[PDB]
Design a protein around this ligand. Structure first.
Ligand SMILES: *[C@@H]1O[C@H](CO)[C@@H](O[C@@H]2O[C@H](CO)[C@@H](O)[C@H](O)[C@H]2NC(C)=O)[C@H](O)[C@H]1NC(C)=O
Ligand SMILES: [Sr+2]
Ligand SMILES: [Sr+2]
Length: 275
């Protein structure tokens, strides 16, 4: 297991966003041409084992631990009735006090805030990716497709990402092999070597959130200089077309940087290889 390994994302120009927005309120449009310099992206979402190495090294206490609660999806025991603030829910106890990560060391770390993610990535000699880096990487060398792999949800009748099957929120059939999270190395990689870029855990990016984008061509854009929420990408194991079609690379959502939840993690990026 090399779950802190990075892959080289090649230099290129790509179309960020879409002129066929599916969630218009989220500023998926307009499509815009963005140039990205070559850099490195973590192949995997940061796992419990990998975060535990960080915590072991630094003593870091996450914002959820200090606040004393975090958001948990009701189905596995607020922004929606199915999100409950649970006392003692944190990265070690993802559904609250009497849950554990002992049996899921290779699953993505959860209940990590934007600040927690920055702390980890910087500790690791890395950083968060920008939204544009994240989206470019998500698209995996394909142009204007819905998903990392193309436009079909189940190409060749195969599951390609961990999202919801069944009637949300009452019934998760586990058709794709996982009701909650999957191991960070589950499912096929995309064209650049990334696993679970869409689905599984949401991923923080460095950008402040806005819904107002120009069509001007940009180079290594960093997002707006100010805001109140940071951008997160890719959707999660909770997402279903019926209520939440956010497992597309162009999709985007937000949370305040001190926020944490049972479907939200991250991966790191770097300009160059670290030690
Ligand atoms: C984080 O630190 C803990 C505590 O040191 C590690 O667990 C110990 O690891 C040693 C060495 O393999 C074992 O002999 C002990 O049995 C473990 N102690 C306990 C109380 O579990 C743990 O492996 C570290 N985590 C990571 C991801 O490196
Ligand atoms: Sr699933
Ligand atoms: Sr993901």
């Amino acid at each position: 297991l090399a779950h802190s390994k990075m892959v080289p994302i090649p230099a290129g120009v790509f179309t960020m966003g879409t002129d066929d927005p599916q969630i218009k309120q989220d500023g998926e449009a307009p499509a815009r041409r963005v140039t990205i310099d070559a850099f490195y992206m973590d192949a995997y979402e940061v796992s419990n084992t990998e975060f535990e190495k960080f915590v072991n090294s630094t003593g870091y206490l996450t914002e959820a631990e200090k606040f004393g609660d975090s958001f948990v999806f009701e189905g596995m025991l607020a922004a929606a009735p199915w999100w409950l603030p649970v006392k003692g829910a944190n990265w070690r106890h993802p559904e609250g006090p009497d849950s554990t990560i002992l049996h899921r060391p290779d699953h993505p770390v959860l209940h990590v805030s934007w600040n927690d993610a920055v702390a980890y990535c910087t500790w690791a000699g890395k950083r968060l990716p920008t939204e544009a880096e994240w989206e470019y990487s998500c698209r995996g060398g394909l142009h204007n497709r819905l998903f990392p792999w193309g436009n079909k949800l189940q190409p060749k009748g195969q599951h390609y990402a961990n999202i919801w099957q069944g009637e949300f929120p009452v019934t998760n059939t586990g058709e794709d092999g996982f009701q909650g999270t999957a191991p960070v190395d589950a499912f096929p990689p995309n064209g650049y070597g990334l696993y679970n870029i869409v689905g599984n855990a949401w991923e923080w990016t460095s950008d402040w959130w806005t819904v107002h984008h120009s069509v001007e061509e940009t180079l290594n854009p960093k997002g707006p200089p100010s805001g109140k929420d940071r951008v997160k990408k890719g959707g999660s194991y909770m997402c279903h077309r019926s209520y939440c079609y956010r497992y597309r690379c162009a999709a985007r959502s937000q949370n305040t940087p001190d926020s944490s939840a049972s479907n939200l993690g991250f991966r790191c990026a770097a300009d160059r290889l670290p030690t």
